[PDB]
Amino acid sequence: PTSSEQIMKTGALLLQGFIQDRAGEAPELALDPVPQDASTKKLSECLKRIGDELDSNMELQRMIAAVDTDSPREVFFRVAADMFSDGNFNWGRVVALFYFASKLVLKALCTKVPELIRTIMGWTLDFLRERLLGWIQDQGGWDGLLSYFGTGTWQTVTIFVAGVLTASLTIWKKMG
Template structure:
């Protein structure tokens, strides 16, 4: 597939929306929980570009399964979920791009983490934070990541990189080490957030 004329901006936006939607499909509540209105992005008219988004979405799901088995990643998500405000995304970016370097693995980790956090915000009945989180990620993609993606040859170039994805490498290089005090806070915040989510699920069942 040629990269000439590939709308990398639209592909990146469509991929983020797909990742968020996929995360809601994993919520075991019989389909009763749906995300608030997602931002409208420019549709992809070219079937090849649509297929690329589907392939990228599948790659994110596979990588996400690996990330879900990584305790450091889950600890970071729990800490961020306790912020309950727009600062969630800023802190997420600070962790994922802690040394200022961009690579395909980190972009995918960012997208997947936003999807997981988005679900937590909706289940905790925080639609405003959900919207701010998704909007902030779209803005960050457009202003910070898109130029790098184009310089690397576009989204099509990410496919081969994703096949070499290493959770161990990403975990070591993309997330700050969490001090023990923060882990304790994350534990109690996780209990609180979990209680809210369980209450929401019971109400919707």
């Protein structure tokens, strides 16, 4: 079903996957790959493609560079809060949030702080549970995410998804 547990599980899987897919290590600390069904695999392939396009948006990469490299806690929550501050929701924003969390993880890996992988995922899944889960339930599950994106629209949806993340980062940056 469209139960809480399953939306949480799929969330954790997608995020972990994205951090695998963007990542192209403390072995005893690894979180094993959530196993993926047909449905989740299609979501994962969706996210990989939109992530690769976001990686090519230079304005967004300048903004992610500005993120407090080894102290990202306050920046994750302020960016997350701001992007959802109008009380509306869309799948582009959910994708933006997972992407950003994934880049924060990658920035920590570089800084060789691997216990942040767990911590950042924890912040993101807590945010999903507290703030997004109701909406994803009303939508009938994670499957809806696929229809936010279409086969001929990747370059175009990217602009708007990059745009929302870059905007919340700009406010975090300028407001200090």
